[PDB]
């Protein structure tokens, strides 16, 4: 019941109301138990609560399998801080403590409401008697697979144990299963659905990556005579939306190369807008100084490399195409963190695209040399291809981002490069074709 889950959420996690409505629906679906559940919510979006609360309110016990020992310990400690009866069965646990946890499990009603487990030892022969004892007694109310993307090779991070967890789902079938992930491409979604042996009916419960307060546009460097002047104008316009407000908030600028990024920062400083460079090339003390300046209002817009949060960000500009489409989305997510509208820009270049594709080729060659994973090797270049295709698409850029993440394509009434003055973006694309 809705009232029961509401009261349980307030009593356990001290949460008066769910942070998101979609996560509330996901929690309803999981506690219902009629069908398996999937969730793709970004870190810090309450994805944990979706699987924690049903376990709290479940008549049995919920097994939560997570790839890292540290992650398991962090979740268990977080729930213990909430006075929740949780256990952590892992190799890190001692023999006596492990036996005590097993004794707790063997009780008629297991003392540990939520049992976290590391997948590698979950396949261990020692755990299997406990696992099938749990299965026979029908005490396993739910199963949870955190970091579900690890099962898919196409995912950024992969775990073969997560391929095995299809077997664990085959076991304990009576218990509904909840797969959880931070970001999941539709390829990743299908890999998770087929590998974990999840039930035929599943609710994806993925938060729409689209944010109404975002403005995605991809200007062409070759099209603009002085792209640095264009970035100066974009920074000036985005820093202030209210004439009385004037310059406010702060933006971010991303660089493909650390060394050229310092030159970029100094020449934007001379442009009239003060900025600082953040990259490995810069000394650590200076890196911290520029980070602090960005966190404060001292620097209107900061300049950083591809590698790195603020309460409110005015804009996130990408002087060069990001290494991966998901990487570009993550970097642009910093923009529009607050409710105030924010603008995200990407400065394409055919030469820059060739350079980035060469970098991706070197990366995939290194993967083949060491990783030896053809699927992920093709996945990286597929992400780069998706980013570029998003770049040269005479369509809603939010729609393309949603397609890459697989969520239903948003429709931007306004505030999107294509959704307003689309013909202008198409003319820019035609000029790009004319140039190359
Ligand atoms: Zn749009």
Author numbering: 12 to 319, 324 to 451
Task: Please share text taken word for word from the publication where this structure appeared.
Here, we show that a generic and kinetically biased ‘Gembody’ (Gb) interface, previously discovered through trapping in crystallo, can also be trapped in solution by kinetically controlled side-chain-to-side-chain bond formation in a manner that leads to ready generation of complexes; these display ideally balanced interface flexibility and yet relative complex constraints, in turn allowing rapid cryo-EM structure determination, even of small targets. Ultimately, after a survey of in-solution covalent bond-forming methods exploring differing natural and unnatural amino acid residues, we found that Cu(II)-catalyzed oxidation at a pivotal C12 residue site (together with the presence of needed Gb ‘gem’ substitutions previously discovered through iterative X-ray-guided engineering) offered a route to direct and rapid, high-yielding formation of disulfide-linked homo Di-Gembody (homoDiGb) without side reactions (for example, off-site oxidation) to form a robust covalent interface. Furthermore, the success of DiGbs for high-resolution structural solution is enabled by their relatively small mass contribution to the imaged complex while increasing the maximum particle diameter for better particle alignment. In summary, our plug-and-play DiGb strategy improves cryo-EM resolvability and resolution of small proteins through constraint and increased particle size with a simple and robust workflow and can even enable simultaneous structure determination of two challenging targets in one dataset.
To probe the applicability and value of these homoDiGbs to cryo-EM structure determination, we tested the 49-kDa DNA helicase RECQL5 as a challenging soluble target with both small size and substantial interdomain flexibility. Next, a larger dataset of this RECQL5:homoDiGb complex on a 300-kV microscope with standard operating parameters yielded a 3.79-Å reconstruction of the complex after imposing C2 symmetry. Because of minor flexibility within the DiGb interface, imposition of strict C2 symmetry prevents refinement to high-resolution signals. Therefore, we applied an approximate ‘non-strict C2 symmetry’ that improved the alignment of the particle images. In this way, this initial map could be further improved by forgoing strict C2 symmetry, with symmetry expansion and local refinement of RECQL5 alone improving the resolution to 3.18 Å. Current cryo-EM structure determination methods typically struggle with targets below 50 kDa, contrasting with our ready solution of the structure of 49 kDa RECQL5. Further validating these methods, all of the structures obtained were largely consistent with deposited structures, with the only changes being small interdomain movements observed in RECQL5 and its slightly different Gb conformations.
